[PDB]
Design a protein around this ligand. Structure first.
Ligand SMILES: Nc1ncnc2c1ncn2[C@@H]1O[C@H](COP(=O)(O)OP(=O)(O)O)[C@@H](O)[C@H]1O
Ligand code: ALF
Ligand SMILES: [Mg+2]
Lengths: 787, 148
């Protein structure tokens, strides 16, 4: 019996205005209706025909077919009154089936965001739904949890307030496998907070003039997306590096600052891209968006004139690199990069590409490939503000200085490249990290944390990168497991409430030790670290040793007798993966020709100057990559544990990159390895809300004005009185030592009431304010008149 | 209303027309009543406006002679707020009997309950009463709008 919904609202709102048809309300008699297996639906509707002990006969309420399955392969169905629910934690039946079902429906109906107890699921639409707009922003602004439907803008506001309420920093962590939308959902959270919390200069979809800084806070992400994102067999615009954005608020609740902690930038691909994959967007953008003039200015020959672009020039669906340029060019300006300050950041790109043309053909005479062609490095050295001859020698004949010797030597064709290669390759990273601090230079008591890590990805060649990436992914998940089941139950113990433990069986510590732990049973990273510092050792040598230590690790497994490639497997949470240990020691060391290194360190070109200005760590003969990372990633894991987590579990619908297509089991597993169900049991089982004896007799005393006597009284007891005063059911709450533990919703209703008990007064007061606020601003226009 | 004031009322009413016909858009009625030291709630104003509609509330006009009859009708009312209760309500948002509420929580309530105000409205109000910790002392803020 409710309002009518615009075709659009039907995308975030449930259609409930219909007739109370008793068709379903009558069919209920087929009570024998249950859920059961389906090699094509994951589960499907059917009704019991005959219960025969451990087994039972049933007929598909679908194919009319009659099949009998074990009396344990069937799953209770939820009433018709639950169709397309908002909070799974509501349906009177929790199942891998129902939970799936619900998600399936809402999904096809056009709604992707759904609540699951505390955290919330979010199946990628892959389509341009219309549920993000100034219009919708203001709809959710201030709106409680229930005063509106599950939507991202909601999680954002729920946190942003929670922060200002109990004064305690927060985090919004987007999980989900690669592609599931970890990124987008982040861009929104900022999008929302950029208007809902910004301060205004006084004063339709995106139509709105934001503050001065929020302006930039907005144009940042579209920059890092350039030199940092690239097309892959899993995502046309994949985030090629974890990212943790930090937004800073004052006491009044306004945005004032913003930091960005970038992580594992897979800059490898800057030299060679896999099949049907691309390099960092910006590259293509430049080779195309390049202006005729500036075109030559950086020696930007067309596509396929550069060898760092495997698969030549591959195109991206629905995206036009041509314009893409300006967009980012436009961004850079918004951000702050000086007119020329950019032109530069561009040449340094072409440079990172030309350095790829440079050749070194073997020499069967001396056996030290040479520079049969100048043009190549000829150009390259120009963009570097350095010199040819020097570069050349340095690049070919390393006038190095090992230990107590000026060991002057000359490398082999290969080495001649492994350098010119791993040089440009690192010259790149020197850029990202630079911009990032240029961006972070403008964007910069409370902070909101948004985490966009790279999602579990697992292609053909499972290199090192993929190892730390799927490592973090395993890492993060475990965080959710801790804070969700482990931690929560400890406090139940602490406060000493009537509670018994529950083992949700959700731990991956093991699979972390196998790759994290150092001394004692070493971790995959450990070995590859030291074994990386010993001559008679090779990736192979490594692996073999790898088998030595781990070997029988419950989470380890040996390859398909391809130690030729020498690969290993590890049982992640998202599944098994066969990594190729090859070239791991090299990457893990990150070496490079210091000759040319320092050569630049004082180059004529200032930009390249300051870029390299810090070369003291180069290798010409300190800390290991795996531990350099693994060290900062503990810094991150540290603050997160010091903030309040808000999980937004993204979920991939299909691998066909198809919209409207939703693979049952693929989505069934995700809900399995992510801990959704369990993640909901405790929300129903335990008491996810708690409040200390003082704040309780404080907020809701207005409800029982005569429960507590005029005299003083012990916080606890004194407030237990007013609990009897509300005749609260002894199953909703749980009194503890210092705080009370309530059940879901119990506190919400308590809040509602209180807000009602005071509305009028507010109404009353509000008036006098408009009064006061008025007589004054009128008696103001009077001065400009009397002026 | 003694002619003495009635005579001045005109001075106030007149002091309210951007163009010049001598008409106060059905909207302005509120502020003009306020400016005359009136604190009519949002309803008390519509009730004596025949409950028009947004659109026509920006078209319809008023002339003192037809306005005056309302100024009074309001002027004489049944109740009014007062420190006594006024603050008694805000003191319910006093996180911990400190005697002060966060200029953000106050800023909320005021724009999410009853006659919902605007983000700017509240800004202009509390603005300058928040301390280092952005803490406002209602007791005072109360008196401010009041005695003011
Ligand atoms: N809510 C959404 N609206 C529109 N497109 C989306 C949405 N969620 C994800 N996408 C689509 O999915 C793609 C990749 O999702 P993405 O955020 O890049 O995942 P991840 O960060 O996990 O790699 C995008 O290129 C886009 O087409
Ligand atoms: F780009 Al992703 F997981 F965020 F592959
Ligand atoms: Mg991403």
């Amino acid at each position: 019996a409710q309002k009518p919904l615009s075709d659009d609202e039907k995308f975030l709102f449930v259609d409930k205005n219909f007739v109370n048809n008793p068709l379903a309300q009558a069919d209920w008699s087929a009570k024998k209706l249950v859920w059961v297996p389906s090699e094509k639906h994951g589960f499907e509707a059917a009704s019991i025909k005959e219960e025969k002990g451990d087994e039972v006969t049933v007929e598909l309420q679908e194919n009319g077919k009659k099949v009998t399955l074990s009396k344990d392969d069937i799953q209770k169905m939820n009433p018709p009154k639950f169709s397309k629910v908002e909070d799974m934690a509501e349906l009177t039946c929790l199942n891998e089936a129902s939970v799936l079902h619900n998600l399936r429906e809402r999904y096809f109906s056009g709604l992707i965001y759904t609540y699951s107890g505390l955290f919330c699921v979010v199946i990628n639409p892959y389509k341009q739904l219309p549920i993000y707009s100034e219009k919708i922003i203001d709809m959710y602004k201030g709106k409680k949890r229930h005063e509106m439907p599950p939507h991202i803008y909601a999680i954002a506001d729920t946190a942003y307030r929670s922060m200002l309420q109990d004064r305690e920093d927060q985090s919004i962590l987007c999980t989900g496998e690669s592609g599931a939308g970890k990124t987008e959902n982040t861009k929104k959270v900022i999008q929302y907070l950029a208007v809902v919390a910004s301060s205004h200069k006084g004063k339709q979809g995106p139509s709105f003039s934001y503050g001065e800084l929020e302006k930039q806070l907005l144009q940042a992400n579209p920059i890092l997306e350039a030199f940092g994102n690239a097309k892959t067999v899993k995502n046309d615009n994949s985030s090629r590096f974890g990212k943790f954005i930090r937004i800073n608020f004052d006491v009044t609740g306004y945005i004032v600052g913003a930091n960005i902690e970038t992580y594992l930038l897979e800059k490898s691909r800057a030299i060679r891209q896999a099949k049907d994959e691309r390099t960092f967007h910006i590259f293509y953008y430049l080779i195309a968006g390049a202006s005729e003039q500036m075109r030559n200015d950086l020696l930007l020959e067309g596509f396929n004139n550069y060898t760092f672009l495997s698969n030549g020039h591959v195109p991206i669906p629905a995206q036009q690199d041509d314009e893409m340029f300006q967009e980012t060019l436009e961004a850079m300006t918004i951000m702050g990069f000086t007119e020329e300050e950019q032109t530069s950041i561009l040449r340094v790109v072409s440079s990172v590409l030309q350095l790829g043309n440079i050749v070194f053909k073997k020499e069967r005479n001396t056996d030290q490939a040479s520079m049969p062609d100048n043009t190549a490095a000829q150009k390259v050295c120009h963009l570097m503000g350095i010199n040819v001859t020097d570069f050349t020698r340095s690049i070919l004949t390393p006038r190095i200085k090992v230990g107590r010797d000026v060991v002057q030597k000359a490398q082999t064709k290969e080495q001649a490249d492994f350098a010119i290669e791993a040089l440009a390759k690192a010259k790149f990273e020197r850029l990202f990290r630079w911009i990032l601090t240029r961006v972070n230079k403008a964007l910069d008591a409370s902070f909101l944390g948004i985490l966009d890590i790279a999602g579990f990805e697992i292609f053909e060649i499972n290199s090192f990168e993929q190892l730390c990436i799927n490592y973090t992914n395993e890492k993060l998940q475990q965080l959710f497991n801790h804070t969700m089941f482990i931690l929560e139950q400890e406090e139940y113990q602490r406060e000493g409430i009537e509670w018994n433990f529950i083992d949700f069986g959700l731990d991956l510590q093991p699979c972390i030790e196998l790759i994290e732990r150092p001394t004692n049973p070493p971790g995959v990273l450990a070995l590859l670290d030291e074994e990386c510092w010993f001559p008679k050792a090779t990736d192979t040598s490594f692996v073999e040793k790898l088998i030595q230590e781990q070997g029988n690790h419950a989470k380890f497994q040996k390859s398909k007798q391809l130690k030729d490639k020498t690969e290993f497997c590890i049982l992640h949470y998202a599944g098994k993966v066969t990594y190729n240990a090859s070239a791991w020691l090299t990457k893990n060391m990150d070496p490079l020709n210091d000759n040319v290194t320092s050569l630049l360190n004082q180059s004529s070109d200032k930009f390249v100057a300051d870029l390299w200005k810090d070369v003291d760590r180069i290798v010409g003969l300190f800390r290991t990559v795996g531990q350099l990372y693994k060290e900062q990633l503990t810094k991150l894991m540290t603050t997160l544990r010091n903030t309040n987590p808000n999980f937004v579990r993204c979920i991939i619908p299909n691998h066909e990159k198809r919209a409207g297509k939703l693979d049952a089991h693929l989505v069934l597993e995700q809900l399995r390895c992510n801990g959704v169900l369990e993640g909901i049991r405790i929300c129903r089982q335990g008491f996810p809300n708690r409040i200390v004896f003082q704040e309780f007799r404080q907020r809701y005393e207005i409800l029982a004005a005569n429960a507590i006597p005029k005299g003083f009284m012990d916080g606890k007891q004194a407030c237990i009185l007013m609990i009897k005063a509300l005749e609260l059911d002894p199953n909703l709450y749980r009194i503890g030592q210092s705080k009370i533990f309530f059940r879901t919703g119990v506190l919400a209703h308590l809040e509602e009431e209180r807000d009602l008990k005071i509305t009028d007064v507010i109404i009353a007061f509000q008036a006098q304010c408009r009064g006061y606020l008025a007589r004054k601003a009128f008696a103001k226009r009077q001065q400009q008149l009397g002026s | 209303f003694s002619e003495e004031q009635t005579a001045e009322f005109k001075e106030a009413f007149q002091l309210f027309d951007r163009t010049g016909d001598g008409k106060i858009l059905y909207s302005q009625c509120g502020d003009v009543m306020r400016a005359l030291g009136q604190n009519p709630t949002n309803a008390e104003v519509m009730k004596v406006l025949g409950n028009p509609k947004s659109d026509e509330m920006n078209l319809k006009t008023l002339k003192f002679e037809q306005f005056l009859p309302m100024m009074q009708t309001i002027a004489k009312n049944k109740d009014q707020g007062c420190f006594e209760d006024y603050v008694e309500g805000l003191r319910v948002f006093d996180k911990e009997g400190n005697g002060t509420v966060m200029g953000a929580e106050i800023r909320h309530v005021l724009v999410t309950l009853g006659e919902k105000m605007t983000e700017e409205e509240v800004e202009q109000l509390v603005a300058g009463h928040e301390d280092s910790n952005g803490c406002i002392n209602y007791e005072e803020l109360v008196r401010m709008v009041l005695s003011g």
